[PDB]
């Protein structure tokens, strides 16, 4: 197990997840296979809040689980859940989450232009630019909504695009060390 896989796992569990997820992954860094009951008594967390975290890590499939059954000294059977880290699946879901967030950038750029620009303050409903011509009355000579009959201002739709554009530069800058970790772990 190379230490570069552990370094990238820490950098994605401390920034994109809470401190409870980071402490759970640090245990799996030290020991490859950790029993559930050992880590219950280690972090002394509540039973319900800790199993929900492991349900979340099973949701993102960062780690895998195996189940074994055995008979104890008293004769009562037990079902201990054994959890082990799998970096082969971990790198794929990180890469999948990276391209999904990357493809989210252009489709947010497209939906910024495809968003509505005509808004009526009376009915508080967005109006399509194509539908604004349909609502226009040729007899009146000026454009209004049919239902509300009020003036339409398009200046409200300009300001959410500029906020998204400035966040494009910050998102590209904060992701470069994560991309550098992927390139160093292609072997």
């Amino acid at each position: 197990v190379p230490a570069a896989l552990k370094r990238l796992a820490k950098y994605v569990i401390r920034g994109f997840y809470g401190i409870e997820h980071a402490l759970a992954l640090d245990i799996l860094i030290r020991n490859s296979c950790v029993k559930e009951e050992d880590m219950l008594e280690l972090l002394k967390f509540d039973r319900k809040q800790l199993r929900s975290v492991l349900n979340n890590l099973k949701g993102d499939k960062f780690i895998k689980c195996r189940m074994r059954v055995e008979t104890a000294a008293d004769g009562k059977t037990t079902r201990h859940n054994y959890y082990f880290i799998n970096y082969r699946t971990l790198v794929n879901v990180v890469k999948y989450k990276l391209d999904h967030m990357r493809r989210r950038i252009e489709t947010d750029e497209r939906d910024s232009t495809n968003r509505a620009s005509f808004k009526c303050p009376v009915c508080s409903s967005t109006f399509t630019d194509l539908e604004a011509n349909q609502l226009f009355d040729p007899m009146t000579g000026t454009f209004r909504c049919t239902f509300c009959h009020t003036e339409v201002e398009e200046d409200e739709s300009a300001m959410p695009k500029k906020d998204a554009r400035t966040l494009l530069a910050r998102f590209n800058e904060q992701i470069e060390p994560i991309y550098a970790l992927l390139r160093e772990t292609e072997d």
């Binding site: 820490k10 950098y11 401390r14 920034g15 994109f16 401190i19 409870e20 402490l23 640090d26 245990i27 030290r30 280690l42 972090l43 002394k44 509540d46 979340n56 949701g59 993102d60 499939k61 794929n92 879901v93 890469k95 999948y96 989450k97 391209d99 999904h100 493809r103 989210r104 966040l167 904060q174």
Partner: protein, 171 residues
């Protein structure tokens, strides 16, 4: 009752004696003078010497005399930072806020002095558990990145869509 009730009165007496500033250790008979237990049994005396004052993690021995343990408990900010760093390095888990409050009087001053060094986790029964802020990796994002990350759901989707999406985008 006998042999199982006088030990609570003894440990309450020397704890309150330590609260008055009595750092110097005391002998067994000196404690027994003010606890009104002069008629205590001799077999109780030998049981206290060999079991009670050595298994208790609040009692330490100096030259055969017993006293409180202020070094193990937290009494200043520097020992709180050192102990919390040791629990982070060895991975022994956090310490409840009530344990620090009873060990360290006026512990709110030490909490506000350290500030962001102590991480607080709110238990459902109002209790708080303290954790070390390991400042080797401090990455934070805006709240709009958090709700966008929560918007995309992967728990209710099979693994065949994850593997196909890699080839769909051509990576």
């Amino acid at each position: 009752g006998y042999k199982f009730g006088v030990l609570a009165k003894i440990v309450n007496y020397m704890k309150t004696r330590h609260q008055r500033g009595d750092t110097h250790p005391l002998t067994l008979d000196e404690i027994l003078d003010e606890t009104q237990h002069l008629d205590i049994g001799l077999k109780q005396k030998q049981w206290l010497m060999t079991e009670a004052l050595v298994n208790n993690p609040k009692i330490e021995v100096i030259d055969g005399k017993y006293a409180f343990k202020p070094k193990y408990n937290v009494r200043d900010k520097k020992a709180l930072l050192r102990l919390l760093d040791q629990h982070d390095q060895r991975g022994l888990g956090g310490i409840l806020l009530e344990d620090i409050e009873e060990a360290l009087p006026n512990s709110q001053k030490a909490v506000k002095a350290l500030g962001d060094q102590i991480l607080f986790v709110n238990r459902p029964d109002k209790k708080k558990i303290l954790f070390f802020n390991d400042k080797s990796c401090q990455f934070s994002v805006d709240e709009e990145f958090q709700k966008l990350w929560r918007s995309v759901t992967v728990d209710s989707m099979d693994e065949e869509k994850i593997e196909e999406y890699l080839k769909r985008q051509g990576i």
